[PDB]
Design a binder for these strands. Structure first.
Ligand SMILES: [Zn+2]
Lengths: 50, 84, 62, 154, 58
RNA sequence: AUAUUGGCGAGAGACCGAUAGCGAACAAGUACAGUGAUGGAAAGAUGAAAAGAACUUUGAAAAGAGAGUGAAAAAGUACGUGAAAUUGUUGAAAGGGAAGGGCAUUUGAUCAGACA
RNA sequence: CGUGGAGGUCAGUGACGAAGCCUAGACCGUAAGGUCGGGUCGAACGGCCUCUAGUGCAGAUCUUGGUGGUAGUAGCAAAUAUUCAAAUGAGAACUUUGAAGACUGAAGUGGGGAAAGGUUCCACGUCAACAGCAGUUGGACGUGGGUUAGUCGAUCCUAAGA
RNA sequence: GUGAACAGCCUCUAGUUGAUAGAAUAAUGUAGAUAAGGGAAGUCGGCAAAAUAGAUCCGUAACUUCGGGAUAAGGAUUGGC
RNA sequence: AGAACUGGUACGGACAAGGGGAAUCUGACUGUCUAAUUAAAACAUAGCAUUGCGAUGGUCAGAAAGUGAUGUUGACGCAAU
RNA sequence: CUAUCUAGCGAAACCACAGCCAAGGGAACGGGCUUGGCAGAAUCAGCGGGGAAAGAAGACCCUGUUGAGCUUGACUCUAGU
């Protein structure tokens, strides 16, 4: 919440830096099977249970 | 109501994060994690949870040290300078 | 264009609320470059923005 | 670009196509079937009357439970409607076909619309939330549209 | 007193702007295809209630 | 001497061949659900080579039609072939409160065989 | 009769097109089924004597996946209420501004906060998807910025209790 | 402000003006009202609805654990200047 | 509190706002429960009575213990009906 | 306010094939069979006779050498004392 801990904040920071798309230059590699980011998460759909 | 209302009174956790497995299992009124008794020295595991004994057992992680022992045994646990 | 944030800043500056604020409709182009709050201060004294008057609640019949 | 069965030559005929369009298959089909075999000038004049609510579009197959009207009589039927998204998405391919023709060198005074067909496309899917804690689909019926014009000869 | 943007950062690393657009579109599309599939493949046994009471006896 | 569905390294099979075979051929004990114990998936193939459609034109834009690459776009990243249900267009035919079927023949369509 | 694989054999067919697939086109067989032509397609496949099985589906409120008719139908009807002009834009019942009308009516549709959520805050750009109509708008999408404590709180004390 | 009243009704500060819309006004409906004469005959049953309703003055029974019953019942008044 | 005057006899003018009475069955009352078909005469209640127990104890617990609840207690108490 | 017509959006239950009747016989109450009556595209709003309409491998009854909750002086045992 607002009056939170640090463990929680640190995990939220991680989840923030994870909440980006896939860099387009990944898709140009020579043997690539990665079209998009499937571990994507947003506060509306899926809550992270910490 | 036993349903759609009484899901509304759900805003205080009976669980939070264990410092040894890192998942929301640490019961806090009693202080024991439900997937690895944390204050306890032994990790919770039962031979009816044979799936659970794959999600946590050896090989799951990095194996920082243990990945190298078959490499070290093969060479005879040698030591010292590499070579010329 | 879209002067919602300008209307917000104007209330915040003047003191009054979002509903006693008047932005000139003939000056949208000049209000839109008020991306800041120090510009609103220029506009309030140029008269492009106005602090409308309190609606009246008389007490004479009382 | 493989098109359907056109019994007409490719030299004296131009083409157009729209794919994965978010308009209703059923109402676009009846729209197209209302202009098959026609002249372009008397089709674009008609689809614009539709949107002005004159000269309706007859619903012949996908016509159950809809209502009756008086602009069906020039087609015989009594059930008709005025679908103004089907219309727009068709009217925007007639323009394309006319252009393709005018750049191929075909005279736009005798062009008629020979082949036109609407298909079903993949559904684009959602959820609606029904009673007693259940779910049911709420999805679109997109349409592929495919169009051909050709100039009338002897 | 500024030089840098993400656009100038991604210019050197391959994709330009029109390829960023053309990549985003197909990326989004392949993200939406799987959603259409997941809804289809869940829709049967999403409405399957373990303890539905059926408020009807008489 | 014996044991060994675990670990490390090797060799093989009258085995399965992507709804199979490990739950997992792929960023799988992943995503996701649940307070929690626990539960637990789906999803492989462009082509030899991206040569992944320069350029022209209509369009607000997607996109389209021309062009072009290719051995092949009836391989255009929704890409191997691409079945069926289901559906559109065209063509033929029939059709008074069902349809379909069996015997027999007319009419129409198609095939036959030269017996040169 | 037929299917997956095995041992022999036809010094078997084949990129000059194998297998597969469509074919109210043909032949054989009582029949299971086999053969041929055409179109499609692109790399392996068959006949015969034998071996061997995870070997043949119309069904199981069968399993998984997919698709239909009903159906452009039921229906998107609580919460007093919207309207005019302009600007923007491809496009405006729904965006922005202005004017009007009205509501909450201070036990509020206001102003803050605890749990909880976790960046939803703010800006710039943007509309394929979401907003069960629309959308130039957005708690959406993309990129980024952003939370400053000797005095507020935790920290310290102890309660029920562990 | 009314009023006993943080009730209800109207309004100022502040906030919103959001809920898919347009046209038409058929049956049957949901919600809200009215009704001649009679007045519960309806109906299992006065279910539903209606009537009464506030304040002031008068007057208030049986029974009673003597505390109540009791706003008993039952009447009149109410504005403005 | 009172008096005049006055009005289409209207006036708690909208809002707000008790229907009343005679009797029977039952439970004393206030209260509680069947979250999502039963709110009731059932449960509880105070009040009355009974039973055990003087601590080496009554009732109860625990796998067991240098173990425990009543018990920071002591018959005007604790426990069981 | 809906229903109704229109722009847009747009599901579900259910479904052997299906959908005009009478009598007959029949698993004893046919949409289909047999004999007759009859029969003309496509259809809109309503309706609630029917489709022994849909929902739910009857819940009552019975059988099972299937069980469970509960009681007791049932059989066999047991903590404790
Ligand atoms: Zn743990």
């Amino acid at each position: 919440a607002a009056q939170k801990s640090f463990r929680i904040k640190q995990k939220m920071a991680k989840a923030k830096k994870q909440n980006r798309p896939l860099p387009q230059w990944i898709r140009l590699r020579t043997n690539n099977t990665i079209r998009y980011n499937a571990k994507r998460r947003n506060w509306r759909r899926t809550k992270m249970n910490i | 109501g036993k349903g759609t209302p009484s899901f509304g009174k759900r805003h205080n956790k009976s669980h939070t994060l264990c410092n040894r497995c890192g998942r929301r299992s640490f019961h806090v009124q009693k202080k024991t994690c439900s997937s690895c008794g944390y204050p306890a020295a032994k990790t919770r595991s039962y031979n009816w949870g044979a799936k659970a004994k794959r999600r946590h057992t050896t090989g799951t992680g990095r194996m920082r040290y243990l990945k190298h022992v078959s490499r070290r045994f093969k060479n005879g646990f040698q030591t010292g300078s590499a070579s010329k | 264009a879209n002067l919602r944030t300008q209307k917000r800043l104007a209330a915040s500056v003047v003191g009054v609320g979002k509903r006693k604020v008047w932005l000139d409709p003939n000056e949208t182009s000049e209000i839109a470059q008020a991306n800041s709050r120090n510009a609103i201060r220029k506009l309030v004294k140029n008269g492009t923005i106005v602090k409308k008057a309190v609606t009246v609640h008389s007490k004479s019949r009382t | 670009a493989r098109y359907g069965a056109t019994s007409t030559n490719p030299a004296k005929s131009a083409s157009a196509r729209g794919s994965y369009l978010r308009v209703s298959f059923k109402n676009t089909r009846e729209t197209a079937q209302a202009i098959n075999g026609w002249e372009l000038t008397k089709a674009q004049k008609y689809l614009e009357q539709v949107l002005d609510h004159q000269r309706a579009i007859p619903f012949r197959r996908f016509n159950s439970s809809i209502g009756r009207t008086a602009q069906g009589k020039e087609f015989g039927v009594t059930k008709a409607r005025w679908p103004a998204k089907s219309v727009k998405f068709v009217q925007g391919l007639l323009q394309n076909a006319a252009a393709n023709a005018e750049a191929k060198g075909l005279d736009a005074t005798k062009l008629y619309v020979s082949h036109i067909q609407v298909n079903q496309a993949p559904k684009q899917r959602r959820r609606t939330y029904r009673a007693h804690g259940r779910i049911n689909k709420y999805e679109s019926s997109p349409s592929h549209i495919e169009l051909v014009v050709t100039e009338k000869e002897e | 007193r500024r030089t840098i943007t993400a656009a100038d950062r991604r210019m050197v690393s391959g994709v330009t702007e029109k390829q960023y657009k053309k990549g985003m579109k197909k990326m989004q599309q392949l993200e939406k295809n799987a959603i259409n599939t997941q809804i289809r493949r869940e829709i049967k046994r999403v409405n399957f209630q373990t303890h539905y009471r059926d408020e009807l006896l008489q």
